[PDB]
Design a protein around this ligand. Structure first.
Ligand code: AZA
Ligand code: AZA
Ligand code: AZA
Ligand code: AZA
Ligand code: NA
Ligand code: NA
Ligand code: NA
Ligand code: NA
Lengths: 295, 295, 295, 295
């Protein structure tokens, strides 16, 4: 037998950082969960019990805290690039670092119409994520994403004209509920190293904001022919607005809400144009994916 | 042996309702999870296999949908009271109904600065709940609550002057992070029946809004001596603003964020006044509760 | 306003303890999650910011580890009683301690037909729990339980003869699937203090084993007329086998598995006597409870 | 813009099937959760709102139930292969089907030492999974796995001799606790189609059993030099025992249990050779992966 692939590191490292403006008294907090996995010339730890090649996962944990102390943690694309580069430069025999960061929302509270200097609320479990792969001699590959953005529209979704055969029971519809949890990922062109990532720093927050805005507006305004058609419209717009993105991937569940026929009870009308009360279905769910790139 | 207590019903009934304004084209959605448990002269279903006394839990499920079709589902205090009253009036041998409702957030989207007519976002997993106990001859008892409101302040929390003995290692502090998930319950005076609940309908949404506002402002503005002292201030204010509330109960975890001593690494300073990077602790957590009533 | 009730402490304290037999080399592990909440003369911490009355929750955490180091952690009824008694005896102004323990399964592995000396498997998420309330001058109240015991029988469950009215759509059946997650609690007679709890130590593990065995055998062998009737049979037997138990409470979900009519597809027969493929329903679910005591 | 990749289908389809032996009266149940995603000539549903190419996800759901009615559902490798093949053969424009199956445990109850004919228990949340990719003209690729197998050993694990530098605080140890949740995947050689999969049917259950047995015995008996070294030993043995497997992948968290220094309290000794009480850590955790193939 032979080791074909190996990676190891530390997962689920929770990190909080506070920034304190001495002039204004305003504080800003960041909270993330970080995973770092390393690859390199480490096969002998598996095959020969040679621990000399192992940077202990506990040390990886320490390094994450030290790096957060000495560097900006925002935008997460930058922090992830700094963290991954550290490992490949510091250790001769480590040749790739894989950094995943999940950013948790701490949104500044408004009290009496004014932003509070040091109080925050978790407004939703929506996350902003990055995956950064730093590979020696091959640069820095970054995939940015938003996830856990849960939306619903109560009309202006249709689904008709699909294939009908002996396995089909679904009725065509011209008015249904559409609800989903949005997972959207944009993949940046390869960067040559940290200097290049640093050169593009302002684009990271701006592109996240654009991706979010395009997703929300398109969902709200499209008279949707299907999840497929609506998601493609979102991806097309993101690619148009940021030239440094190579591909956009969406993964969308179709979280079904079923009509409830109540006509058995005193002829109560609750279907079609008379539908008011629906039964949300926990499972199963449609799952629709697409990756959109440039012509 | 004898049956000392019994209750049965349907849990986890998901319900969605849409309201459509024909004049303006605006749609408003409500989504809840409902549990209804019944009590009454039902012992023989347990002791003698006498199913004749059982209103099937499937029928309870149907009744929830029918009731939602025929009645307002907001405020949830009213809907719960209507639903519970139905069971005790309809069935001679059912003498109490226990209705629990969890309301899920569907907040209207703003697109380009204007409220969208039929698109919604789940902004946080904060819930608004009710527990309604309808008991034949004893009226309607309602407990309203908010839960899952997650907040953090990065300074203006202290904890010193506590008991110190041979079990104590905790250092006194004059500046710490305070973070919690708020669970707050206000218990209404007993209502004589549905007519009385109907008479107070506007107070339900207004009191929820007050409870939320008081919680947020007090958390943000109190220079907190302890979770205990801050929570008492919240409860006192709610009781002052709504005379029809008898008690307010808070249950607050203290979600700890620990300093990380990095001085072992190149004398890096990250404690006390120099603390910037902290380690959020998933467990254990303090848990602090109090019920506040009137003198 | 006045403080009507207050309790505070530490939740989610994970504890592991190992016992090592020096003679045989056999090791035995215990893992639990512990919560301890205290009550007493502590109102002033809430009303006056008087922390002098607060035993810090961090100190409660330390005490749990110290107590586990110095005492047996099994049976959990005993450990909980020792832990609660400590707080009311040590602190003059603390008058009640509420201890909740969840015991996690670590079952000794069999390798090649022989029990391994120091390797364990988590065989299911079934838990054994205790709630111990130690109240100064009022003794020790213990509720023992098992939870998370998930079972299914594929036949020998019926449900017919229930109330039928205009809200009823459920068909009577003489053969259905029955599946549930068992939550069973037995409440001991009040104990005067630790000496009395110590006197009954062997009864705790034996009664847990009896409760589990009675639950499994009754579920498997009863030709069930309803969840109600089957659960009552379980409770009756437990009360018969242990005189020191005052009440037994069961709380059982009815986790539905629905028939799927496939007759629309080539007249395929999959209902009634021909039912082979079913759709498990995640929600809603029936919920049936009963508390059984002595005549 | 252009569609670079697309797949869509139905996720979270829960399925139960019962087999009834008429001769013996013995019943056997199977429960799974199934996901099926399709690929093919479907770009126009995204780009042109052309639904004519869409096999509705609802129809995919129906097909799963129909297929389960007409075919064995065990071993899951076979069922997944039948299900995937159906889609590529039935629909001209569908060229790949991706089937994921999670099998849930329903283990026959022993009552009074004898196997019960129709009663089952969920003994642990361990799963047996398959991923089957059926690609037109390219055969059938199957990855089989077990997951959620949670184990702990209380001694006979070591970790010393790792890299030490200025980021290192971890002490070397010759005796620690090792606990993990095992995720193990074996990838079969490509099969030419269903006939070939059918030819190897007995190997599927036997290889799963071997993988499980090798994992448990190796974990229990290895005096482990590291997670890396122990996992490699497991993989090597599986590859030796089944020639039709090409690679074995393990992904193992290192779920840490920390010593608790209690010496501050009356010089209590609870570290090193005196360690009895430990603190399980929920996070962070090491994460160690390896893929082992043939020389
Ligand atoms: O088994 C281990 N492998 C590792 O890579 C490691 N790093 N810290 N502790 C560890 N234990
Ligand atoms: O066992 C049952 N008990 C009930 O109360 C019930 N209601 N619907 N189905 C049921 N099954
Ligand atoms: O606010 C607090 N209240 C308490 O009771 C406590 N105990 N430890 N830290 C604490 N913080
Ligand atoms: O938007 C949809 N896309 C689909 O592929 C589908 N299949 N069923 N319903 C559906 N809705
Ligand atoms: Na390197
Ligand atoms: Na009545
Ligand atoms: Na006392
Ligand atoms: Na095809």
């Amino acid at each position: 037998s032979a080791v074909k692939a190996a990676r190891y590191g530390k997962d689920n490292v929770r990190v909080y950082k506070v920034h304190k403006d001495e002039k204004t008294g305003v504080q800003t907090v960041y909270e993330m969960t970080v995973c770092v996995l390393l690859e390199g010339e480490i096969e002998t730890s598996y095959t020969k019990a040679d621990n000399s090649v192992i940077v202990a996962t506990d040390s990886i944990k320490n390094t994450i805290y030290i790096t957060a102390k000495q560097n900006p943690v925002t935008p997460p694309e930058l922090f992830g690039s700094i963290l991954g580069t550290h490992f490949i430069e510091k250790y001769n025999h480590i040749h790739a670092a894989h950094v995943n960061i999940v950013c948790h929302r701490w949104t500044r509270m408004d009290i009496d119409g004014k932003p509070h200097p040091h109080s925050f609320i978790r407004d939703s479990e929506e996350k902003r994520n990055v995956q950064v792969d730093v590979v020696e001699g091959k640069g820095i590959d970054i995939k940015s994403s938003l996830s856990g953005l849960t939306v619903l529209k109560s009309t202006n979704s249709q689904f008709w004209g699909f294939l009908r055969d002996e396995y089909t029971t679904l009725k065509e519809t011209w008015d249904r509920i559409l609800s989903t949890d949005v997972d959207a990922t944009w993949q940046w062109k390869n960067f040559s190293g940290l200097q290049e990532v640093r050169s593009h720093v302002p684009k990271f927050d701006a592109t996240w904001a654009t991706a979010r805005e395009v997703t929300l507006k398109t969902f709200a305004e499209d008279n949707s022919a299907s999840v497929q058609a609506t998601m493609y419209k979102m991806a097309e717009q993101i690619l148009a607005r940021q030239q440094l993105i190579e591909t956009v991937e969406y993964s969308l569940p179709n979280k079904h809400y079923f009509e409830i026929d109540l006509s058995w009870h005193k002829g109560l009308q609750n279907t079609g144009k008379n539908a008011e009360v629906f039964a949300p279905q926990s499972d199963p769910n449609g799952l629709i994916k697409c990756t959109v790139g440039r012509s």
